[PDB]
């Protein structure tokens, strides 16, 4: 039952990089996701939630293997979002390229590059206002995660977004 780790990132600026040391307590598989903050529904008309939904998309993909597990047609997205979208709307949402680089810290404190991957992230993740990036098997140990946002998204200006690692419980 390890606690999730969250790393704030900035999707409004191209080339924004964040680097953090990450300790894996249990050899298991872990979900890597983005979590978007949203104004409470009580505050606004629910409008902020709808804009974030619009950005994320409606289709869903399993982070473990990339299989599509959720399909949604334009008609339903139009019913949900109304005037926020037009008929060119893609239910995959806005594609957000994220580059993840992972080094393992060795016993002698040298660093070993074990992954360097560009994800063309898309779709609507399992949790609330999330986008699922990937699932990765990590052994117990210490790692450096470097997360780079490739493109600028003006919709994300001033908005908090977390890169999050949490254990896959199934």
UniProtKB/TrEMBL annotation:
InterPro entries linked: DUF5625
Domain DUF5625: 7-167
Protein name listed in UniProt: DUF5625 domain-containing protein
